[PDB]
Design a protein around this ligand. Structure first.
Ligand SMILES: Nc1ncnc2c1ncn2[C@@H]1O[C@H](COP(=O)(O)OP(=O)(O)NP(=O)(O)O)[C@@H](O)[C@H]1O
Ligand SMILES: Nc1ncnc2c1ncn2[C@@H]1O[C@H](COP(=O)(O)OP(=O)(O)NP(=O)(O)O)[C@@H](O)[C@H]1O
Ligand SMILES: [Mg+2]
Ligand SMILES: [Mg+2]
Lengths: 339, 319
């Protein structure tokens, strides 16, 4: 998956903004209240409306003084370039218009009926909503969300592992029944092989998270243990040779672990999904940890085909591949392409 | 309320720590993983055990390698000096000792039966737990908690604030006292938030409605909902409202403990925080501030440094 162009009119601080995204680390740099998250949430609205997210509401997100909100997103997936267009009318949801098209040669052509329902169904088939919200787009303040519960984590992990190319093949063979030694034996074989493949994926996620978290904490925590048990995915950190629960960590260490785990999932998915969007990675991190973040950008974020990073921290500029500066001018966001 | 001395043995990273708190801004500076929040949570445990907070578990907070945890707190309230002492023994219960005493004449005297239940009951009457957690000690990550719920805000405020036709006039004075209290908090919050945001938001509106306390920010002359704010702005508003509440109660409570005020703040807002420490935090008789941000040392009255050496917190008194 690759975002190419985002056009936004009258969404929060954005009156008329166009952003071209590219390969590599795209950094959006801006002060508090400049329009960074507004841009990222417009992308989320563009892709997945209707949302049932409490802090995102149409009546609220229309720019003050305007009546009409417009979002136009162009992205690539599996070789096909897609375009989704949405228009919202403030306080009057009957002028609301939605469209999703694909690029056929030189022409944009409808890929489904121009309706929220049809577009939603199509998008869900392209990239499941739960995968996007919990493994691709990490909203401001949600870095440690995947640490807080054996509910959201188990679900996203299971759904992430479900993206494996052989998953549907496994499930099918599991359905046949001849009551024969051949059928039973084969289904048992498939079930075992699938379980081992998952365990390997989870081990690989644990390996990556361990390497990143050890780098982050200068070896203070020697491993991040990721263990599937029944309907749970357990997470531990190893300190002085033994597994400890996540409450062992400090507030800053928790952010560091969240980043480690997010990155590890994105790296495991670098081929299948290939996109990470991260909004303000520095909260609670001390000076040393922010420095390590730059190192981890160089060594890990560079290994994900497309990354969109948003921050107020100027020191991250040097580690990005493309820099866009956003600022608030006359009550409207202004976007400047630096790199 | 004033904190005087906290003594901690084998609590998280603390093998053996003593900290003396004083009047004014007490800043504890330390890196990630050094022992700052551990110290503050030990104070919470010391005062209000048993707690039913998910991330604070007796079986977990005993320092690794050790068996016995000890917390000893000295504090003043309403002119009386109190000492609470707790000893925990991991895995077991009946071996534990809890005591609370007051300075009568020369020596410490039990205020109640030396038991968790009796002490809990006494502490609740002296300083209700809900007031301590919601208005006095703001835990790491909780700065904006008070921004979340009209009804939750209502409860905190409610607790922190408190012939045949004579019943009609009773409700009148009550709603008037309430509205005046809210107006003052609003005024204080507005002043602080406006300074914090360089006048981007001209006012913070704190409005009484039945069962609720509504919160709005004024932008370009109109009230907007809290969702209008950016992430960093929300932190600044949380700080403004917390400070406003502490300032309103400076004569009754007089203590504020804040853990890591700088998350999500940009460089400009972090510099502004220092100005706000100088102008407002210093109006609160005792403040305990802990942070990894060295820049904050500027406006502190007393500075303590904490660092982790060979697996244990070490406290250094700088000033
Ligand atoms: N409906 C609206 N109309 C006009 N402006 C709005 C509207 N809603 C929100 N805003 C403003 O949009 C600004 C930017 O919000 P946001 O994009 O979340 O900030 P940010 O760049 O992500 N900064 P931060 O997270 O604090 O570092 C806010 O400061 C609001 O003042
Ligand atoms: N039972 C324990 N025994 C020994 N060490 C522990 C124990 N529990 C937690 N720790 C350690 O205590 C350290 C300090 O935690 P904490 O006091 O929360 O950090 P902090 O100083 O507040 N830093 P931060 O919030 O990240 O800026 C942690 O980093 C853990 O390694
Ligand atoms: Mg933001
Ligand atoms: Mg802390």
């Amino acid at each position: 998956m690759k975002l190419e162009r985002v056009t936004v009119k009258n969404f929060r601080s954005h009156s008329d903004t166009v952003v071209e995204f590219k390969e590599g680390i795209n950094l959006i740099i801006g002060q508090n209240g400049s329009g960074k998250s507004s841009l990222l949430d417009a992308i989320l609205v563009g892709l997945y409306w209707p949302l049932r997210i409490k802090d995102i509401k149409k009546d609220e997100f229309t720019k003050v003084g305007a009546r009409d909100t417009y979002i136009d997103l162009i992205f690539e997936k599996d070789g096909t370039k897609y375009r989704i267009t949405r228009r919202f009318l403030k306080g009057y949801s009957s002028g609301e218009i939605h469209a999703m098209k694909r690029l056929v040669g030189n022409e944009w052509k409808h890929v489904t009926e121009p309706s929220s329902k049809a577009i939603s169904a199509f998008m869900e088939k392209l990239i499941p909503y739960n995968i996007f919200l919990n493994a691709i787009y990490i909203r401001q303040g949600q870095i440690d969300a995947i640490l807080e519960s054996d509910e959201a984590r188990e679900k996203v992990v299971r759904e992430v592992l479900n993206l494996d190319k052989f998953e549907t093949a496994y499930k099918k063979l599991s359905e046949l029944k001849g009551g024969s030694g051949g059928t039973e034996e084969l289904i048992e074989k498939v079930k075992k092989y699938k379980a081992l493949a998952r365990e390997a994926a989870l081990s690989k996620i644990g390996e990556l998270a361990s390497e990143i978290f050890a780098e982050f904490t200068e070896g203070k925590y020697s491993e991040v243990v990721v263990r599937a048990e029944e309907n749970k995915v357990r997470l531990f950190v190893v300190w002085e040779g033994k597994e400890r629960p996540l409450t062992f960590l400090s507030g800053g260490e928790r952010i560091a672990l969240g980043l480690a785990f997010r990155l590890a999932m994105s790296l495991y998915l670098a081929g299948e999904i290939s996109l990470l969007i991260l909004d303000e990675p520095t909260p609670y991190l001390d000076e040393e940890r922010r420095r390590k973040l730059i190192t981890i950008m160089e060594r890990y974020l560079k290994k994900i085909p497309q990354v969109i990073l948003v921050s107020h921290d100027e020191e991250l500029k040097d580690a990005a591949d493309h820099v866009i500066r956003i600022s608030l001018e006359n009550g409207s966001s202004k976007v400047e392409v630096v790199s």
